[PDB]
Amino acid sequence: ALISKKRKLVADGVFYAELNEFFTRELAEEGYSGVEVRVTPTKTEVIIRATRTQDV
Amino acid sequence: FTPVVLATPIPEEVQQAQTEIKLFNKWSFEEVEVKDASLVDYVQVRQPIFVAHTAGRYANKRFRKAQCPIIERLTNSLMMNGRNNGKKLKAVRIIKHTLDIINVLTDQNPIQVVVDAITNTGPREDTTRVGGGGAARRQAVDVSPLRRVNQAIALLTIGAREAAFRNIKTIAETLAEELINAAKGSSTSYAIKKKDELERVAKSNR
Amino acid sequence: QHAVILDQEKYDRILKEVPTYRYVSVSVLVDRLKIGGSLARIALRHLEKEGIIKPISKHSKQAIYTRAT
Amino acid sequence: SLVVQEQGSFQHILRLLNTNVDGNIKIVYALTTIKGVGRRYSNLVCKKADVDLHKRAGELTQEELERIVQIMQNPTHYKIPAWFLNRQNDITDGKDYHTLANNVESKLRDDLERLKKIRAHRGIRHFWGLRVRGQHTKTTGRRRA
Amino acid sequence: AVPSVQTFGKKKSATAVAHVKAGKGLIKVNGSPITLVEPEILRFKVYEPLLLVGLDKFSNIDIRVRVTGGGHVSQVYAIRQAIAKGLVAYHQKYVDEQSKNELKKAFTSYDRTLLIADSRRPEPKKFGGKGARSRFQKSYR
Amino acid sequence: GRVRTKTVKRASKALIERYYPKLTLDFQTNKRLCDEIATIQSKRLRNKIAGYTTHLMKRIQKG
Amino acid sequence: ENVWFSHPRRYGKGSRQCRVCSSHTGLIRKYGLNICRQCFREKANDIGFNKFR
Amino acid sequence: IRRAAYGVVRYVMESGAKGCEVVVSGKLRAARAKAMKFADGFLIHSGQPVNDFIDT
Amino acid sequence: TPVTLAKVIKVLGRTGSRGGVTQVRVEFLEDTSRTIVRNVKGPVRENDILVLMESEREARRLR
Amino acid sequence: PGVSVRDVAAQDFINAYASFLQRQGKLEVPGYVDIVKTSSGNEMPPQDAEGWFYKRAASVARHIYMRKQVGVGKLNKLYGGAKSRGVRPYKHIDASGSINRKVLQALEKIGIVEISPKGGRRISENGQRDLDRIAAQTLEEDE
Amino acid sequence: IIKIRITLTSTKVKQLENVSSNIVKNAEQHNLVKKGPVRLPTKVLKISTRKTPNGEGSKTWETYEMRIHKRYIDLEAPVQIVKRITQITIEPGVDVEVVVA
RNA sequence: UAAUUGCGAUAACGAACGAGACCUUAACCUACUAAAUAGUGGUGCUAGCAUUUGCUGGUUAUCCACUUCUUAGAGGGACUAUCGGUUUCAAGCCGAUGGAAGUUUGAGGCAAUAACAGGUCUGUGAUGCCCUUAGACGUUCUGGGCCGCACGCGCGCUACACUGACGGAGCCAGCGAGUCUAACCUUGGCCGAGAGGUCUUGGUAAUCUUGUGAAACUCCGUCGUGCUGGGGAUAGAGCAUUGUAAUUAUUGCUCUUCAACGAGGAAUUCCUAGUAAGCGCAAGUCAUCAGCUUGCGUUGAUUACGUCCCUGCCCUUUGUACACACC
Ligand SMILES: [Zn+2]
């Protein structure tokens, strides 16, 4: 808590990047296309667009 | 002149010169006129000014410089020898002192004195290197009034500068003596020496 | 070399020769005479004192004077 | 206007403490000709000596001259702070000196021979004539002299 | 209520702001008069707008000014433009088109930016060189 | 060079070839006509078209 | 459990170094990174930044 | 490599792309490297519309 | 000295391999029929005067 | 009719007030005034060791007339300037702090000035009046 | 009734803008005060790097960017539309915050 | 044309990439929406002079109004608009008008096909192959070095001084950054000559640091052309902090020592307007140090508006014993 907005948003970007590389490295078999982040108060949602859900 | 007094008190000497005629600091541009032909349109005095500061855009066009006041061009030429770039204000003060001095000795219109100095320093023939397989000789050619005048100003300021440098005399004093010995064809000035040298060289190369 | 003090003959010379000029200043003194330079400043003060010369302008770098009248 | 015509009371180029000082010059920078003194130290000592420094240096009769000598050689005694001194908390006397025109070099030589005797690396850079403090040697100092 | 006017002048990064009101005819800036703006030469550059029009036109209007930013000379240019703006702005509003146009013509026959700001601006540094146009040296060998 | 390129020449040509009984010689109303009539993604280029069309109708009025 | 390898050290190059490569040649500490640029600009929009001029 | 690239490109231009491109760089069947280049339809490389329309 | 002035009628071009030269036609300012070619150094337009020492030379193309 | 200091030029008002402060003579100058170089980045102490203090204080009070509140860190930034680092490039350096401190002190002693809440110091109504009077002096020096 | 402060921050100006607009819309759909959005000076985060890993080549530099915008709104209302308007307006790429008074 | 930009011409026709277009940035907007983290103005309350009502001030919200300055959303605004002259009288160019703006408006960004054995395994947990791998090339901890000095070269900093050094005072910018599970920016107060110390305070920021009162620059005055007081190297003494740390001096403060250098030979780089040049400021490295770099703004020019003569580039043509391509 109590963090500047600049450093917060840079951290958001780094969070996005780390998740993206992570799902790239993990979900190769499953046809991973991309991600989306939706920050809310209480239940922050992460959508994952990939080919197969049977496997994901 | 019939003054107009006002809340800000504003001295009368200043209202006086203002609403009487639109002079330089103390110096009129009436009765001054170019002595020499070829040398109107290039040396331009018929608008007046107050002091020779102006941020104008003269380098854009080929010749809008020539519509610039010659004094502004002179000030602009002093700010060089790079310890004095951006020191056009210092130059204006130096020029102020110089006109005071050229009035002190030469009561005449010192603007006109300057005009005569320029027109007497303007080399009316100048050299160029022909291509010339071998020695690539020099060829005598004429020189436009504008380049003539520019080199004139340059020569005057450079002579004054090289005098004033390792010497106690101030840039205004050197400039004053240079303009004086140039307004007359005294042949004591750096400028007139160079004029004679170049012109005589041209005579040799024709 | 120039001179950095008076011998009273320079004192006479100044009052005798400077009114010859319609143009007077520091280096004018330092050339026509041989003066320590700072003393040309003091002398131009001494002729600002009374109407031996008439300053039409001055400055800290430079000073401008003339004939008495 | 300080226009004064004084004739013979002036005395041009003169000498003090085995070192010559022009009389024809402003006194503060005049004394700078001495060694172990800077412009502002010369300012300070004359400031303590109650002198009019608009003068040139041929003025200031022997009384004022010797007074300045005293204020100089006895610095702390005339309210000189320790921190304006060339040699502070010396070495073995541990005191604060303004060693001067010849003793300056005497004492420099003393310190030099001291650490060259004890054979410190600083003394050995002094020994072989190298750039003492830790700048690089490769590219500078040439045209050795 | 006080049939006044507000304008502004500008330069590279100096900006002048002025308020021109029906008044006794004072002329001041930053709590100080025009008479004491002391770079000590360009006092005349700020005089100029008073004088292309003449001085009777100001006895009827008090004039307050301030500036901010730029440099010592940029501020002078900002003010000497803002002034001629404020006056002719007053005359747009409170006197006739013909007088206003006479004012403008008096200025413009003489113009030194005077009411049209100098649109020259600084350029950015392009890398590998200390300036936009300037560059460092090379050796070639 | 203050040249106009082929896209502009072509579009202006087609505009005048099928809207000749509009398209006055005034840049501004022709500009509004362009904004009303065409599927265009840049104001700058739109001005280019308007100016050129005007020049075109002008020399057409000259025959 | 011995003192005196970091005998002298605490400022100067070497307590500021790259996650990627421990590089300290002219790092960038803006916004908490300390990435040597050799790494970083390959990480360039791997931050999520973009350039427009 | 040919079959793979042309099948992908075929699938894309079937999916409805305006154009595609496949560059394969390195050592393919030998030591000296060679960049093979496969493509279809259309592409631009310089405006901001690159940043708008194409995904790389 | 028999100095002459000459008012420019027409520029002919910029000779000289490097282009510091400018050729020109000029009327001798005393004789309307005296139109003469000559070389010049600096910036020039028409409606301007040059000063001549030699009123005879009439140089030609150069390099 | 009605006078302020901003209607006076800076240097001449300052100098008039500086000289006035000595004709008064009651200013409480310290003893180390004669030695300190006025900054670690000046090249020399004041050429006029006599009244540089009074010039400084007269400048200070003028500063405080026009500013709401001002403080020591600001004064040192102000009266300090470019340094002479010799061989490596110059840069701006703040002036000495003890100087401005003692100036503030002996000025609030006179009550021209006072501590300002919100920080620093500010003129008193007393000094306000006095300095309007001195501005009137500087104006009426024109006979 | 409460006297609330709100702030919006984002890079996606179109998202933040229409979010602000819908906020103001729902607000003045049942008039609250007005407190229009206060477009603050936008913030750019500037990088300066060399385009080139190991520095063979021309000294090619590159400045990356993160163009950030911010703006705030005040309002006044009781319990319900406070919590309704806090949550009902939400968007990815757009960060939000509320303060009591 | 700046352009394979067009005019057109035409065994070519019709298409595509590139350039352009595009996006960014900076310049115009009294037109809109707003604003105690931007501003005003009045209103209260209040200081000072004058008092004749006024001028300068203060007062975080006394309240009110406004948005011109400020900021930022959408929009407008230039298209070479108008006139004139040019030209196959086409594409286009020149001049003038007006315009915030008339060089592609400026400066950028982006950037084709083909190729280099250009650089990089010392960016990568990208990586083939080889080598090693326990007395290891891994890892850790002891110091040192990378800085070692006859010399050569490169980028650069400071000077050679009067267009200057120095002492006072004036005081004017902007790009930016900034403390959480911590110790940034630090104001302000006190002490200290200074460097620094010390007690508090604002700030996760248009709120506080900060108007970052920067520099030069300006005005007054000391200086007097004397390697001079220019110059401040080198070298010495001590004080500060920085820091488990300072010797191989960290840096800075105090004092002393005052080198060389009088515009720099042959040779050679950069640049055409807010440009060069000077000027300093921030950021970058920063738990210290920039003489480095990226950006910023302040002051602010001379000269040209052309040529291919050098150095090379572009297109055509031509010649050729070259194709590792005139090295
Ligand atoms: Zn790294």
From Swiss-Prot, chain C:
Its main location: cytoplasm. The keyword Cell division does not apply. The keyword Cytoplasm applies. Signal peptide: none annotated. The chain holds residues 37 to 105 of 108 of the full protein. This is Small ribosomal subunit protein eS25A. It comes from the Eukaryota. One of its GO terms (biological process) is cytoplasmic translation. Component of the small ribosomal subunit (SSU). Mature yeast ribosomes consist of a small (40S) and a large (60S) subunit. The 40S small subunit contains 1 molecule of ribosomal RNA (18S rRNA) and 33 different proteins (encoded by 57 genes). The large 60S subunit contains 3 rRNA molecules (25S, 5.8S and 5S rRNA) and 46 different proteins (encoded by 81 genes). It is found in: Cytoplasm. It comes from Saccharomyces cerevisiae (strain ATCC 204508 / S288c) (Baker's yeast).
From Swiss-Prot, chain F:
It comes from Saccharomyces cerevisiae (strain ATCC 204508 / S288c) (Baker's yeast). Component of the small ribosomal subunit (SSU). Mature yeast ribosomes consist of a small (40S) and a large (60S) subunit. The 40S small subunit contains 1 molecule of ribosomal RNA (18S rRNA) and 33 different proteins (encoded by 57 genes). The large 60S subunit contains 3 rRNA molecules (25S, 5.8S and 5S rRNA) and 46 different proteins (encoded by 81 genes). The chain holds residues 2 to 64 of 136 of the full protein. This is Small ribosomal subunit protein eS17A. Signal peptide: none annotated. Belongs to the eukaryotic ribosomal protein eS17 family. Component of the ribosome, a large ribonucleoprotein complex responsible for the synthesis of proteins in the cell. The small ribosomal subunit (SSU) binds messenger RNAs (mRNAs) and translates the encoded message by selecting cognate aminoacyl-transfer RNA (tRNA) molecules. The large subunit (LSU) contains the ribosomal catalytic site termed the peptidyl transferase center (PTC), which catalyzes the formation of peptide bonds, thereby polymerizing the amino acids delivered by tRNAs into a polypeptide chain. The gene is RPS17A. Present with 30900 molecules/cell in log phase SD medium. It is found in: Cytoplasm.
From Swiss-Prot, chain G:
Binds 1 zinc ion per subunit. The modification Phosphoserine is found at residue 22. GO terms for biological process: cytoplasmic translation. Keywords: Cytoplasm, Metal-binding, Phosphoprotein, Ribonucleoprotein, Ribosomal protein, Zinc. Its cofactor is Zn(2+). The keyword NADP does not apply. InterPro entries: Ribosomal_uS14 (IPR001209), Ribosomal_uS14_CS (IPR018271), RIbosomal_uS14_euk_arc (IPR039744), Ribosomal_uS14_sf (IPR043140). One of its GO terms (cellular component) is cytosol. Pfam families: Ribosomal_S14. One of its GO terms (molecular function) is zinc ion binding. It is found in: Cytoplasm. The keyword Mitochondrion does not apply. Zn(2+) binds at residues 18, 21, 36, 39. Component of the small ribosomal subunit (SSU). Mature yeast ribosomes consist of a small (40S) and a large (60S) subunit. The 40S small subunit contains 1 molecule of ribosomal RNA (18S rRNA) and 33 different proteins (encoded by 57 genes). The large 60S subunit contains 3 rRNA molecules (25S, 5.8S and 5S rRNA) and 46 different proteins (encoded by 81 genes). Component of the ribosome, a large ribonucleoprotein complex responsible for the synthesis of proteins in the cell. The small ribosomal subunit (SSU) binds messenger RNAs (mRNAs) and translates the encoded message by selecting cognate aminoacyl-transfer RNA (tRNA) molecules. The large subunit (LSU) contains the ribosomal catalytic site termed the peptidyl transferase center (PTC), which catalyzes the formation of peptide bonds, thereby polymerizing the amino acids delivered by tRNAs into a polypeptide chain. This is Small ribosomal subunit protein uS14A.
Swiss-Prot record, chain K:
There is a cross-link at residues 3, 14, 83 (Glycyl lysine isopeptide (Lys-Gly) (interchain with G-Cter in ubiquitin)). It comes from the Eukaryota. GO terms for molecular function: mRNA binding; structural constituent of ribosome. Keywords: Acetylation, Cytoplasm, Isopeptide bond, Ribonucleoprotein, Ribosomal protein, Ubl conjugation. Signal peptide: none annotated. It is found in: Cytoplasm. N-terminally acetylated by acetyltransferase NatA. Also partially acetylated by NatC. Its main location: cytoplasm. GO terms for biological process: cytoplasmic translation; maturation of SSU-rRNA from tricistronic rRNA transcript (SSU-rRNA, 5.8S rRNA, LSU-rRNA). Component of the ribosome, a large ribonucleoprotein complex responsible for the synthesis of proteins in the cell. The small ribosomal subunit (SSU) binds messenger RNAs (mRNAs) and translates the encoded message by selecting cognate aminoacyl-transfer RNA (tRNA) molecules. The large subunit (LSU) contains the ribosomal catalytic site termed the peptidyl transferase center (PTC), which catalyzes the formation of peptide bonds, thereby polymerizing the amino acids delivered by tRNAs into a polypeptide chain. Belongs to the universal ribosomal protein uS10 family. This is Small ribosomal subunit protein uS10. It comes from Saccharomyces cerevisiae (strain ATCC 204508 / S288c) (Baker's yeast). The gene is RPS20. The chain holds residues 19 to 119 of 121 of the full protein.
